[PDB]
Assembly symmetry: C2
Homo-oligomer: 201 residues x 2
């Protein structure tokens, strides 16, 4: 009861909901779905989800928005243990850990890798779950573009090394999308309290 | 550009707790394509050639022709919650329940366990099929969640998550890798044979 159905993109539900539900002023019920970027417009218009936590989709930007945070995508990889990166960008056919071809982050990385034809890589692991790519990268199996907030503590400890920070960086902005049409009594209550909570992410 | 691709439709909990160990140990002769898919959705994709293997739990009909099975390991799902410096008790009026949806093996199994035990009054508070999300919400003191011990082993030994039962409410689980017993690509037959060796 008093359910709030949220469908988030394949890699930003973790960085948001734990902090949201803990700091939420009043108590709701939550149902969370990991959807692709393509299924964002349709699920809102049909009412499949009351709110969609997605990136900067300018199609949704008859909708209302609220920017949750701002981050970047840094190419990272685990170290040898010597303090040197296990792989390197200038290495012939380095193992690449990428997102799916239909994900929002996957299209950004493949866009940058097309522009920078200097990088010679080999696809090794592809999945739209950023948590899976993060733990696969820590094993030292390849290079991955990971969000800064998702590896902030791992970057501090040299268990993941930043390989580039000038041109291979992809800025990302996460939003919470709502239809401008007024919703239930509980959805407006949740949307208001989240707006009163954006000073915590 | 994918003759070394292996399509893996795994359970959300198993894909994030077991697959990184598999990928690290395997020889890098492969290219992995993994997606978190419900087991009742992954079986349909397995027959029509949309996936090569699926990683899920004990299925009665998936362990027989025209399928082949590999018993990956064995584990259990413990009732768990955050610490008080336990915030919640299983013997408590309407405790908030963090649980998977019915579109996931673990969701039905937890709900069917609570079916027999009417002594526990709970309140469905947060439902999602992403295990890592269930875990973080549990560690922030939001409710009780039945999480697998392979995913919360070290936070149990650190106190951030306290086991709430070690008797009736601990449900056993066994990880499994399934596939059609028919021929696939050479890159997938090698991975399957290495999986029998990897289990040990």
């Amino acid at each position: 009861l008093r359910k709030i159905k949220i469908a988030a993109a394949h890699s930003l539900s973790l960085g948001l909901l734990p902090t949201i539900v803990k700091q939420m002023p009043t108590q709701f019920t939550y149902a969370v779905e990991a959807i692709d970027v393509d299924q964002a417009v349709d699920m809102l218009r049909e009412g499949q989800s009351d709110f969609i936590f997605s990136y900067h989709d300018e199609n949704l930007q008859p909708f209302d928005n609220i920017r949750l945070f701002e981050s970047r995508l840094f190419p990272v990889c685990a170290n040898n243990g010597r303090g040197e990166p296990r792989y390197t960008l200038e290495q012939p056919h380095f193992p690449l850990l990428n997102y799916s071809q239909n994900s929002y982050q996957g299209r950004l990385i493949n866009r940058t890798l097309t522009r920078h034809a200097e990088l010679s890589f080999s696809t090794f692991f592809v999945s739209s779950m950023s948590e899976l790519l993060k733990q696969v990268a820590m094993d030292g199996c390849g290079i991955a573009w990971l969000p800064e907030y998702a590896i902030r503590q791992e970057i501090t400890d040299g268990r993941l090394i930043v390989l580039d920070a000038d041109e291979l960086v992809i800025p990302i902005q996460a939003y919470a999308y709502r239809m401008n049409t007024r919703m239930s009594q509980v959805a407006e209550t949740f949307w208001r309290d989240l707006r009163g909570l954006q000073a915590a992410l």
